[PDB]
Amino acid sequence: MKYMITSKGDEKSDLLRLNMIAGFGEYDMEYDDVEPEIVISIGGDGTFLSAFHQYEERLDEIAFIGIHTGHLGFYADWRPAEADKLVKLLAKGEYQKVSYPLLKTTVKYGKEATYLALNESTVKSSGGPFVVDVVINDIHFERFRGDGLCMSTPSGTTAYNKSLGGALMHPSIEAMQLTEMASINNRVYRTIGSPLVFPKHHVVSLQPVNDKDFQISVDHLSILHRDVQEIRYEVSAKKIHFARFRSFPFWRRVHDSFIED
Amino acid sequence: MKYMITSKGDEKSDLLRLNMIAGFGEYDMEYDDVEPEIVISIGGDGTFLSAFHQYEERLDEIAFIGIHTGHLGFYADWRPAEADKLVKLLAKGEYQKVSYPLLKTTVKYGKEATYLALNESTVKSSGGPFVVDVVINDIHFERFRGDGLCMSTPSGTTAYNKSLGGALMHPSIEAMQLTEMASINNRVYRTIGSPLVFPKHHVVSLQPVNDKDFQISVDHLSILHRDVQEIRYEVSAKKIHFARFRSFPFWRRVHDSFIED
Amino acid sequence: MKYMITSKGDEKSDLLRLNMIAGFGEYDMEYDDVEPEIVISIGGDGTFLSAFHQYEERLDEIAFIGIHTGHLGFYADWRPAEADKLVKLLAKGEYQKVSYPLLKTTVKYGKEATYLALNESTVKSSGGPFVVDVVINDIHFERFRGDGLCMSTPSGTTAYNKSLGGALMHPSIEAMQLTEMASINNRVYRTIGSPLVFPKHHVVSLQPVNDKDFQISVDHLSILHRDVQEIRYEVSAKKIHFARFRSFPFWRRVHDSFIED
Amino acid sequence: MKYMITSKGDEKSDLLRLNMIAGFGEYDMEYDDVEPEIVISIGGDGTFLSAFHQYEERLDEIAFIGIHTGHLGFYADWRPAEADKLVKLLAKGEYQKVSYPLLKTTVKYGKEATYLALNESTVKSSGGPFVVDVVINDIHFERFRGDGLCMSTPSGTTAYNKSLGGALMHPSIEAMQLTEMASINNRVYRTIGSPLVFPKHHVVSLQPVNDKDFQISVDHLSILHRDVQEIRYEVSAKKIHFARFRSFPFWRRVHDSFIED
Ligand SMILES: CC(=O)SCCCCn1cnc2c(N)ncnc21
Ligand SMILES: CC(=O)SCCCCn1cnc2c(N)ncnc21
Ligand SMILES: CC(=O)SCCCCn1cnc2c(N)ncnc21
Ligand SMILES: CC(=O)SCCCCn1cnc2c(N)ncnc21
Question: B219: burial class by Cβ within 10 Å (0-12, 13-18, 19+)?
Answer: buried
Is-catalytic flag, B227? no
Search chain B and give the residue with CA nearest D71.
B188
The string over D47-68, giving b where at least 16 C-beta atoms fall within 10 Å of a residue's C-beta and e elsewhere, is: bbbbbbbebbeebeebbbbbbb
Mutate to test the pocket of ligand 4, among D8, D41, D45, D221 (most ligand atoms within 8 A of CB): D45
Question: Contact C219/C119 with Cβ under 8 angstroms?
Answer: yes
Question: Contact B105/B236 with Cβ under 8 angstroms?
Answer: no
CB within 8 A of A164, min separation 6: which ones?
A150, A179, A180, A181, A195, C182
The domains found in chain C, sorted by start residue, are 1-101+238-261 (no CATH), 102-237 (2.60.200.30)
Q: Which of residues 143-172 of A touch C (CB under 8 A)?
A: 146-147, 160, 163-164
Q: Which uninterrupted H or E stretch holds A161?
A: helix A160-163
State the nearest Cα–Cα gap between C260 and chain A, in angstroms.
Answer: 6
What are the residues facing B37 on neighbouring strands?
Answer: none
C83-90 contact pairs (CB < 8 A, 24+): C83/C16, C83/C19, C83/C20, C83/C23, C84/C19, C84/C23, C86/C20, C86/C40, C86/C245, C87/C20, C87/C23, C87/C24, C87/C27, C88/C23, C88/C27, C89/C245, C90/C3, C90/C29, C90/C38, C90/C65, C90/C243
CB within 8 A of B88, min separation 6: which ones?
B23, B27
Q: How many whole angstroms separate alpha carbon B149 and alpha carbon B164?
A: 10
CB contact under 8 A, B185 and D261: no
Q: How many whole angstroms separate alpha carbon A95 and alpha carbon B101?
A: 34
Report CA-CA distances (Å) from D125 to D129, D132, D210, D218.
6, 10, 11, 15
Task: Give the pairing of strands A196-199 and B168-169.
Answer: parallel
The sign one gets for the Cα dihedral C30, C36, C37, C42 is: positive
Show the DSSP H helices in chain C as ranges.
Answer: 11-24, 45-54, 83-92, 160-163, 250-258
Search chain B and give the residue with CA nearest A143.
B259
Ligand 1 centre to CA of C132 (Å) is 18
Question: Contact C147/C224 with Cβ under 8 angstroms?
Answer: no
CA D90 to the chain's CA centroid: 24
Q: How many whole angstroms separate alpha carbon A66 and alpha carbon A6?
A: 10
Question: Contact D74/D119 with Cβ under 8 angstroms?
Answer: no
The sign one gets for the Cα dihedral B29, B33, B39, B41 is: positive
Q: State phi, psi for A171 to the nearest 5 degrees.
A: -65, -10
Strands (E), chain C: 2-7, 30-31, 38-43, 63-68, 96-109, 112-117, 120-125, 130-136, 139-146, 148-152, 168-169, 175-181, 196-199, 204-208, 214-218, 221-225, 228-244
Q: Which uninterrupted H or E stretch holds D33?
A: none
Residue A185 contacts B, CB cutoff 8 Å: no
Q: What angle do CA C120, D177, D102 make, to 5 degrees?
A: 130
Method: X-ray
What are the residues facing D169 on neighbouring strands?
Answer: C197
D159 labeled binding residue: yes
CB within 8 A of C246, min separation 6: which ones?
none
3-class secondary structure per residue, chain B: CEEEEEECCCHHHHHHHHHHHHHHCCCCCEECCCCCCEEEEEECHHHHHHHHHHCCCCHHHCEEEEEECCCCCCCCCECHHHHHHHHHHHHHCCCEEEEEEEEEEEEEECCEEEEEECCEEEEEECCCCEEEEEEECCEEEEEEEECEEEEECCHHHHCHHHHCCCCEECCCCCEEEEEEECCCCCCCCCCCCCCEEEECCCCEEEEECCCCCEEEEECCEEEEECCEEEEEEEEEEEEEEEEECCCCCHHHHHHHHHCCC
Report CA-CA distances (Å) from C150 to A27, A128, C119.
57, 18, 10
Across the beta sheet with B221-225, what order do the strands follow? A168-169, B196-199, B175-181, B148-152, B120-125, B214-218, B221-225
- Within 10 angstroms of residue C177's Cβ, the number of other Cβ atoms is 27
Question: B7: burial class by Cβ within 10 Å (0-12, 13-18, 19+)?
Answer: buried
Nearest by Cα to C17 from C31, C28, C35: C31
Which amino acid is present at D24? F
Tell me which residues have their CB closer than 6 angstroms to ligand 3: A 184; C 45-46, 49, 74, 119, 155-156, 158-160, 163
Search chain B and give the residue with CA nearest A170.
B198
CB contact under 8 A, B137 and A165: no
Helix (H, G, I), strand (E, B) or coil at D87: helix
State the nearest Cα–Cα gap between B147 and chain D, in angstroms.
Answer: 10
Tell me which DSSP letter residue D167 carries: P
- On the CB side of B157, how many CA atoms lie within 13 Å of its CA? 32
Selected residue of A160, A187, A221 to mutate for chain C interface (largest C Cβ count, 10 A): A187
Ligand 4 centre to CA of D159 (Å) is 4
Q: How many whole angstroms separate alpha carbon C146 and alpha carbon D121?
A: 34
Q: How many whole angstroms separate alpha carbon C124 and alpha carbon C144?
A: 11
The sign one gets for the Cα dihedral D38, D43, D44, D47 is: negative
Which one of C10, C28, C33, C45 is the catalytic residue? C45
Q: How many whole angstroms separate alpha carbon D79 and alpha carbon D60?
A: 26
3-class secondary structure per residue, B215-240: EEEECCEEEEECCEEEEEEEEEEEEE
Q: How many whole angstroms separate alpha carbon C207 and alpha carbon C215?
A: 14
CB contact under 8 A, C164 and A187: no
Which one of A28, A32, A33, A45 is the catalytic residue? A45
Q: How many whole angstroms separate alpha carbon C253 and alpha carbon C159?
A: 13
Across the beta sheet with D148-152, what order do the strands follow? C168-169, D196-199, D175-181, D148-152, D120-125, D214-218, D221-225
Task: Give the pairing of strands C168-169 and D196-199.
Answer: parallel
D96: region left, alpha or beta (phi > 0 left; psi from -120 to 50 alpha)? beta
Q: What is the CA radius of gyration of chain C?
A: 20
Q: How many whole angstroms separate alpha carbon A198 and alpha carbon A178?
A: 8
Question: Contact C226/C213 with Cβ under 8 angstroms?
Answer: yes
The sign one gets for the Cα dihedral D78, D79, D82, D87 is: positive
State the nearest Cα–Cα gap between C147 and chain A, in angstroms.
Answer: 10
What are the residues facing B104 on neighbouring strands?
Answer: B116, B234
Which amino acid is present at A9? G
C106: region left, alpha or beta (phi > 0 left; psi from -120 to 50 alpha)? beta
Helix (H, G, I), strand (E, B) or coil at C152: strand
Q: How many whole angstroms separate alpha carbon B23 and alpha carbon B25?
A: 5
Q: Which uninterrupted H or E stretch holds A28?
A: none
Q: Which uninterrupted H or E stretch holds D189?
A: none
List the chains bordering chain C where 3 or more Cβ pairs fall under 8 Å: A, D
